[PDB]
Amino acid sequence: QPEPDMITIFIGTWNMGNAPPPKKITSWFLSKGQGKTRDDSADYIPHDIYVIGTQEDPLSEKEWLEILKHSLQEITSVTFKTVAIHTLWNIRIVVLAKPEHENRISHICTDNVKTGIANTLGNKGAVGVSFMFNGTSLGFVNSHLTSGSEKKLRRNQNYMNILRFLALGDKKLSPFNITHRFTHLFWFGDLNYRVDLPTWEAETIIQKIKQQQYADLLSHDQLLTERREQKVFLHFEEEEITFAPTYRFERLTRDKYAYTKQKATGMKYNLPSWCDRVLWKSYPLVHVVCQSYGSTSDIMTSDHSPVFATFEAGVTSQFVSKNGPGTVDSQGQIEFLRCYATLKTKSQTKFYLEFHSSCLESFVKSQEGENEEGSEGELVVKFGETLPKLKPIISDPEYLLDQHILISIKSSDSDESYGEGCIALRLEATETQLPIYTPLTHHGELTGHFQGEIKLQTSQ
Ligand SMILES: COc1ccc(Br)cc1CNC(C)=O
C-alpha cells in the first residue's frame, strides 16, 4: 500500500450564531453553493483530512462530533477517525481523518490564545491543531477576531497575538512562530473584516450582491486592503472570492441582509461583509492548489453562512536510509556561500544565524557575521564563505530536494531572533552555486531579507 505524495484537505469555517445547526449540513462538506464549487462527480470521494472551525458554537464537543461524523459517513460511507478537537469558549476546531491515515498521523498538538485585555478579554481568540502526516507538518488555526467595522486595527493586533502565542508544532523550533513551523499552515475563521463603505450605501451594496457584482465591494474589503498594505497576514495566500458576503443575514432565509443598527448589535451597522475566510501559507515550492472556495446557500440557522475551502497539498513519506535517521550521510552537504542579511533594525549588536531543519540531526549556529552600513541607511550582515557546512541525515535527492532550511538571525547580545525565514532545497541543479532568497519576519512583520547562494550535494 504506497504512501501518498498528495492529499486533499477540507477547511470549513462557520460562525453558528449560538444556534443549533439544521438537520442537514452536507452541502458544506461537498463544497456546494456559491463561489468556486466542487464538481458533482467528486461527491462520493472523501477528502483525506477535514478541519472544521466554528465560532459562537452552542453545541457540546460530543454533540458536534456526532453531527460531523454522521454527515461525513452519509456523504462518503466512510467512518472518520477523530484526530483532535479543541474548544476555547465558543470557538472550536475539529480535525477528522480517513481511517487509512490513523498510523500516518503523529505529534498532535492543540492550543488556544485569548485576545484583548480586561473589557476585550472574554470571548475572542483562536484555537489550533498541528500534527505530522508522514514527513509533512500541518498546522490549522481557527480564529474569531474582534468585531465591528471600525476595529480593523484591533483585528490586526489579534492576528499578531495569535501567531506569537499559539504554541503548535515542534517546540525545538524555538526562534519560529506558527507562520514558519509547518509545511502547510491553514488560517481560517470569523476574521471579522468588513466592507468599508458608507452606511448610507447599504441598499446599493445589497443591489450589487443581488447582481453578483462583487468587484466594487472587494476593493473595499478590509482584509484585502490591510493585506495589500502589509498590515496583516504577510506571506499568506487567499483564493479569489466569487461568493456573496457571508454576513449578516436574517436567520431562516438567505434572501435578506440584516445590516441596520439594533440594541442587539450595540447600535452598530453590519454592512454585508466577507467575515468568514480561509487563508494559507506553505513552504516555498511545495505543491498547494485551492480546488474550492465558497459558501453554502441552504444552511440558514445562523446570521453567517458556512464557508468551505479545499486544497490539494503535497506530502512526503517518512524516509529511512542505511545511514540517517540516527546518523549523517557523508554523501550529502548543504553549503551557503556569499550570504548576507539586510535588517531594518537600528541596533548595533553582532548577529549570528541558526539553521533549523528535520534534514539535520539538530540546529546549527553560525559564527557572527560582519556588520556594514547599507547605502540607504540599512544594516547589512555579511557571512561570506564562513557559514558552517550543513550535514544532512540522508543524501538521497528524492528526500533532500523536498526539504527546507529555516533561518533565524539572532543578536549575540540578547540571543533574541530579529528575523526568521525559510529556504527550499527544491533546486534547479545540485553541485551548482544557485541564488537563494527569503524575506525575514519577526512577530510576522517584515524585518529584513536574507540572500546569497547555495550549493547542494546529494548522492546522485
Ligand atoms: C497518536 O494519536 C492519534 C493518532 C491518530 C489519530 Br486519527 C488520532 C490520535 C489521537 N486522537 C484521539 C481523539 O485519540
What is the largest distance, in Å, between two alpha-carbon atoms of the chain?
70
Same domain for 354 and 281: no
CB-count burial class (<10 Å; 0-12, 13-18, 19+) for 122: exposed
Confirm or reject: Cβ of 97 under 6 Å from ligand 1.
yes
Same domain for 335 and 321: no
Closest residue CA from atom 10 of ligand 1: 83
Q: How far apart are CA 139 and CA 83, in angstroms?
A: 13
- Cell numbers for 94: 475539529
Confirm or reject: Cβ of 96 under 6 Å from ligand 1.
no
Q: Report the SS3 class of residue 104.
A: helix
Relative to beta strand 136-144, strand 184-190 is: parallel
Same domain for 255 and 177: yes
Same domain for 273 and 343: no
To test the pocket of ligand 1, the residue of 105, 106, 107, 133 to mutate (highest count of ligand atoms within 8 Å of its CB) is 105
The minimum-distance atom of ligand 1 relative to the CA of 99 is 7
The minimum-distance atom of ligand 1 relative to the CA of 103 is 5
Same domain for 275 and 354: no
Other CB atoms within 10 A of residue 85 CB: 19
Q: DSSP state, 172? A: T
Closest residue CA from atom 6 of ligand 1: 83
Least Cα distance to 278 among 314, 248, 236, 247 occurs for: 236
CA distance to 81, 208, 235, 423, per residue, from 439 (Å) = 38, 39, 9, 10
Confirm or reject: Cβ of 81 under 6 Å from ligand 1.
yes
Q: State CA 238 to chain mean position distance.
A: 10
3-state helix, strand and coil shares in percent for the chain, rounded to the nearest 5: 15, 35, 45
Same domain for 315 and 445: no
Confirm or reject: Cβ of 82 under 6 Å from ligand 1.
yes
The minimum-distance atom of ligand 1 relative to the CA of 81 is 7
Other CB atoms within 10 A of residue 177 CB: 22
The minimum-distance atom of ligand 1 relative to the CA of 101 is 7
H/E segment holding residue 276: strand 276-282
Confirm or reject: Cβ of 279 under 6 Å from ligand 1.
no
Cell 454585508 found at: 272
Same domain for 229 and 186: yes
Other CB atoms within 10 A of residue 100 CB: 13
User: What is the chain's Cα-based Rg?
Assistant: 23
The minimum-distance atom of ligand 1 relative to the CA of 83 is 8
Sign (positive/negative) of CA torsion 122, 305, 245, 203? negative
The minimum-distance atom of ligand 1 relative to the CA of 97 is 7
Contact 126, 144 (CB under 8 A): yes
The phi-psi region of residue 300 (left if phi > 0; otherwise alpha if psi is between -120 and 50; otherwise beta) is: alpha
Domain range for 136 is: 1-325
Listed residues 290, 308, 325: the one ending a domain: 325
Listed residues 309, 325, 341: the one ending a domain: 325
Same domain for 279 and 140: yes
Q: How far apart are CA 441 and CA 58, in angstroms?
A: 37
Confirm or reject: Cβ of 195 under 6 Å from ligand 1.
no
- Cell numbers for 328: 549523517
Resolution for the entry shown, Å: 1.6
Q: How far is the CA of 128 from the centre of ligand 1 (A)?
A: 15
Q: How far is the CA of 260 from the centre of ligand 1 (A)?
A: 46
Q: DSSP state, 260? A: S
Listed residues 293, 325, 357: the one ending a domain: 325
Confirm or reject: Cβ of 102 under 6 Å from ligand 1.
yes
H/E segment holding residue 410: strand 404-411
Q: Nearest 5 degrees, angle CA 194-CA 200-CA 204? A: 75
Same domain for 404 and 390: yes
Residue length, the chain? 460
CA distance to 184, 197, 223, 276, 396, per residue, from 280 (Å) = 7, 27, 14, 14, 30
Q: How far apart are CA 151 and CA 96, in angstroms?
A: 34
Q: How was this structure determined?
A: X-ray
Nearby residues of 152 by Cβ (< 8 Å), 6 or more positions away: 193, 194, 196, 222, 226
Same domain for 370 and 275: no
To test the pocket of ligand 1, the residue of 65, 78, 79, 82 to mutate (highest count of ligand atoms within 8 Å of its CB) is 82
Same domain for 166 and 312: yes
Q: DSSP state, 327? A: S
CB-count burial class (<10 Å; 0-12, 13-18, 19+) for 102: exposed
Closest residue CA from atom 8 of ligand 1: 83
Same domain for 378 and 315: no
To test the pocket of ligand 1, the residue of 49, 69, 72, 81 to mutate (highest count of ligand atoms within 8 Å of its CB) is 81
Number of domains in the chain: 2
Strand order of the β-sheet with 136-144 is 105-114, 125-133, 136-144, 184-190, 276-282
